[PDB]
Amino acid sequence: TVPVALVTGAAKRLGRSIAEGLHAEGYAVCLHYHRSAAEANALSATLNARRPNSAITVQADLSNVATAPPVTLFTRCAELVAACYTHWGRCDVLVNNASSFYPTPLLRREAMETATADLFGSNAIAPYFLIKAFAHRVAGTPAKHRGTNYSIINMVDAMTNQPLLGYTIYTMAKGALEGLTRSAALELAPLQIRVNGVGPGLSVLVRSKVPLYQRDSSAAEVSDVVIFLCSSKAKYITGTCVKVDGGYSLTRA
Amino acid sequence: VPVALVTGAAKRLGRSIAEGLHAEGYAVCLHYHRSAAEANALSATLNARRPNSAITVQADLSNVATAPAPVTLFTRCAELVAACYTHWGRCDVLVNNASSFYPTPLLEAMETATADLFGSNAIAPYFLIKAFAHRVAGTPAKHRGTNYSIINMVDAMTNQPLLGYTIYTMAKGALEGLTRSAALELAPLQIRVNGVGPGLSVLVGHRSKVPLYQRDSSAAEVSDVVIFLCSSKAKYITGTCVKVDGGYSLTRA
Amino acid sequence: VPVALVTGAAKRLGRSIAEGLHAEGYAVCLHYHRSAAEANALSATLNARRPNSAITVQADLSNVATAPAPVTLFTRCAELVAACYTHWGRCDVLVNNASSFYPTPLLGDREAMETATADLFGSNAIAPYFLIKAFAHRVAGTPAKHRGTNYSIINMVDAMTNQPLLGYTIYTMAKGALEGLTRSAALELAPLQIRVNGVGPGLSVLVDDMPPAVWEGHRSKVPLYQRDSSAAEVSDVVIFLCSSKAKYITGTCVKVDGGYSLTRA
Amino acid sequence: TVPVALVTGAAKRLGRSIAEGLHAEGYAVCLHYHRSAAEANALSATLNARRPNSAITVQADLSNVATAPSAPVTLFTRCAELVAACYTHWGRCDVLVNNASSFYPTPLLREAMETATADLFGSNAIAPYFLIKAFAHRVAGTPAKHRGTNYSIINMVDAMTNQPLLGYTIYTMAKGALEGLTRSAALELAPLQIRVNGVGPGLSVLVDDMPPAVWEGHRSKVPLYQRDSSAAEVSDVVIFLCSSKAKYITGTCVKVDGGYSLTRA
């Protein structure tokens, strides 16, 4: 049986590495993207050449706004999950990785309204709707036909408890995502859907403060953790957030 | 004579916080959404005990636009803070207490639920804090108050999620992130930002589950903590969430 | 007139806690280990303000047996609580404040390791356990009609142990043990209405035995005020937690750190 | 080629499963035991039959007490001897798993109290400290050119200690101390590239010395599967954390509890 994984913001960096790691384990992968069309399609071509019909790409703005055919964020999220079912007839793994990240200072408007909707949508609201859509499809599937290893991974932040100066909305959205991890893990446990979090510290910086190695991590150093959590060997883990930060959160100023 | 703005001040914990602050000498701006009668009765009581010591202001704190060019949530939040400056010339304390609470099970009405639960519990508090901070920054150093304090009403039990309340749980998680991020960024202006998290308070069985006293708390048992945190004796406390739950979070199923 | 037992009450935070409780009307038992002169001067001050409102008791709270059959740590702890009952007939509040603090780096000197372990663990964790146990037994043995109406135990923790200080492993471990004691005791003593909370300072009355610039550098790291706290800024929190207005709070650790734990390197 | 792992309390249950899991990955394993001599030797025989000279056994009481050999043997010396056994036999020690642990009630409400404190604290916290110290020293004393490339220490913690089990104060305190050791050691040993993490079970291979309905009632509370875990469900996590794929993870505690810590009464 060939399982299916949906990875948001899969075009580059950590998302690409997660998609590659899952693919290497045998998963068919739905690569979501927003603006990185070229990169997403190049990645899909690579994976499809390795193994035919093992990758597809889907586009969506995950910000909490209405788009042009007006389509709500929920519908767009449900359509992402539906794309996996339409093409492969299943969705076993969901990785909420897509995320906007920029300053929203509290001390010195439309730019602030799109910032709020963008940072909250990508990091928290979209993951909620995606989890909701993912869960309904599992519930609507007769018990004898269900997969045996459902797993949802939310990409969190090991450092949000030590907030980055000027990134309040981002920090708040990651906090929301932690609560989603715990609430979904509890509510979806009856359907045997596990929900966990992976929180990087400093990964693939475009440094000397990280206790372990005095460097940021590679994409694999994070993605390998995600892949392990999706494996059947991790089937008793749920509702937990795993830090992959080389001890950075243990530091103080 | 200092000024305090309390959201959702009409009854229960909001009313007790407003009463507690008033007893300490504060002039209080009592915000309300639908409880006009209860808010005005409370204002009358406080004004009778001390003239010009209470006012009432109305606002929907949900993350939606209202009719007067439609009015955004931010504008309504800035107007709440401005009401304090227009009437008394100051705002020393902000208590984010207003909160919607109802189920959003994972297994059009979901659009207003999202905006309502997220707005009241997280987005409105963000904008209110932003407006509060701007008014302090725009005040010349010599005229500034000497005890600025913001209290966010959180939940001691969200880490042990209530089944079916995902959006609420997520929003409280966002509110905790706001507490830490705001405390760090507003520290230079000496504005303290803390949280108070009830467990079970003023309940409409479950009571017998609370280790301490085997009952839910009274409104005062929570509000007295809030008042202490606003006092100058608590001036070195910032960015921390204080549980007022009688040991409920120490329990397991 | 209620009674408070404060360990390591001779100076700094302990002294301020003792003063704060005394100002609220409490009679105070001031424990000390090596600061006899300071403890007795403090007792004299409190007794002058209000007669028979202070006493002093000496004890090594390290996890070792002392010369009288040797005297165990438990017996010494029970004796501390008993001193309050012998003199005033009650003990309403216990503040576990006494604490040793020095390096135990992981990277005829067996004496130093054996004694460091017993000292840092005893003062910060084991003695607090035995003290709480003795405190709880005295309340349980009191007929419900004679019991006080506001029992409160405060454990002095550390807001920064989750971001460990380099080279202080045993200290950090002991403070972790103290957090577990706070939670476990709060749950088990709830039926007797004994509340158990923690207060965790960040940087308070920072010792200045170093160059001025290095000292100013350390406190400048604290987000709120860019300084370490005063003893009162911490003790006032402890007093509030013991007040009847805080009667629904139990099993919680309150940080008094000016946002220091929110920082990263 | 051919790394070495030291696992305390390796004779049965989780410890055995961790030892088996590491052995299956290619590790040579030093199986520590206290009272389970027969079980430990049977396990060693199985592993050695599967791959010659791939398992040894060493005995030690990890309680914080001195033992009779001229002078009495301290806990530290016994801990250093455990690590030394690995170097004497195989010339290396890449992985240390602090799994051994005593667990029984210490209610708040003579020789029994003194030995419980030393036993529960020694096995769960103090021995792990000394073991880590000895492990770290052997790495530091090794020339850089000769050192292993994947050092990893795993401390077996408890996912449920923040929701204390009624009447287990000393155990809960010791597990709290163990969490502090995890963070402190991770920070101090980072320069030597020694990773220190924790794995916290909820309910695993739950002991059943009680009416069947009571047993069923307890495990039914775990949200995921409504049952306690198998030993493998925990040990597989430990093995992953020791793998080179987990080399950026340090100072973190991973719950393996099926969502049990998410529950409330």
Ligand SMILES: NC(=O)c1ccc[n+]([C@@H]2O[C@H](COP(=O)([O-])OP(=O)(O)OC[C@H]3O[C@@H](n4cnc5c(N)ncnc54)[C@H](OP(=O)(O)O)[C@@H]3O)[C@@H](O)[C@H]2O)c1
């Ligand atoms: N890298 C780190 O040091 C670090 C640290 C802590 C946490 N994290 C978390 O780890 C995850 C991945 O990290 P990363 O650094 O690889 O992320 P990233 O490069 O910053 O962004 C990942 C992808 O998210 C997508 N995205 C952003 N806004 C979107 C929106 N409005 N709608 C739809 N997609 C949107 C983008 O897709 P397109 O390019 O296609 O537009 C982007 O490529 C994130 O959740 C992040 O928060 C990373």
Ligand SMILES: NC(=O)c1ccc[n+]([C@@H]2O[C@H](COP(=O)([O-])OP(=O)(O)OC[C@H]3O[C@@H](n4cnc5c(N)ncnc54)[C@H](OP(=O)(O)O)[C@@H]3O)[C@@H](O)[C@H]2O)c1
């Ligand atoms: N009570 C508890 O056991 C408990 C437990 C955990 C946390 N808390 C937190 O403590 C705080 C107070 O608790 P509570 O029980 O007193 O709260 P509550 O009675 O449920 O509600 C407080 C007020 O919030 C206002 N509100 C709700 N939605 C609003 C919106 N869309 N816009 C503007 N105002 C809105 C309402 O004002 P109007 O009546 O005027 O419409 C309501 O009176 C809340 O933040 C709550 O989350 C309470």
Ligand SMILES: NC(=O)c1ccc[n+]([C@@H]2O[C@H](COP(=O)([O-])OP(=O)(O)OC[C@H]3O[C@@H](n4cnc5c(N)ncnc54)[C@H](OP(=O)(O)O)[C@@H]3O)[C@@H](O)[C@H]2O)c1
């Ligand atoms: N100050 C800070 O920045 C800071 C930061 C974090 C946490 N804390 C916690 O807050 C509490 C008080 O802080 P502090 O700085 O005021 O403490 P401190 O000055 O270092 O010490 C308080 C007292 O502990 C007593 N003590 C030490 N070892 C003892 C032992 N073996 N037996 C009996 N008593 C012993 C000493 O009493 P004698 O003088 O009589 O010998 C000492 O005066 C401590 O628990 C500490 O861990 C403080």
Ligand SMILES: NC(=O)c1ccc[n+]([C@@H]2O[C@H](COP(=O)([O-])OP(=O)(O)OC[C@H]3O[C@@H](n4cnc5c(N)ncnc54)[C@H](OP(=O)(O)O)[C@@H]3O)[C@@H](O)[C@H]2O)c1
């Ligand atoms: N099983 C669970 O549901 C659970 C839950 C939470 C945490 N944990 C943690 O996971 C780890 C393993 O769990 P487990 O249930 O497998 O443990 P366990 O069966 O209770 O005990 C493991 C071993 O510890 C050794 N031990 C006890 N006291 C000792 C001492 N004084 N000196 C030396 N060795 C001593 C014993 O070795 P001998 O038999 O040779 O005497 C025993 O076999 C423990 O650290 C435990 O705290 C387990």
Ligand SMILES: C[C@H](O)[C@H](O)C1=Nc2c(nc(N)[nH]c2=O)NC1
């Ligand atoms: C720069 C910062 O310290 C750190 O590397 C982070 N980067 C990112 C992040 N989140 C996103 N979406 N993208 C990033 O590049 N969280 C933390």
Ligand SMILES: C[C@H](O)[C@H](O)C1=Nc2c(nc(N)[nH]c2=O)NC1
């Ligand atoms: C029973 C329930 O869990 C508890 O009383 C809570 N009530 C409320 C809450 N939040 C709000 N806004 N209102 C409540 O009545 N959080 C928790």
Ligand SMILES: C[C@H](O)[C@H](O)C1=Nc2c(nc(N)[nH]c2=O)NC1
């Ligand atoms: C020096 C350190 O950074 C901090 O101010 C602390 N001081 C002390 C402490 N504990 C004790 N007993 N004494 C201190 O002076 N814990 C933390």
Ligand SMILES: C[C@H](O)[C@H](O)C1=Nc2c(nc(N)[nH]c2=O)NC1
């Ligand atoms: C019974 C209890 O709820 C749980 O299964 C635990 N068991 C054990 C434990 N720790 C040890 N050493 N042994 C156990 O059997 N911690 C928690």
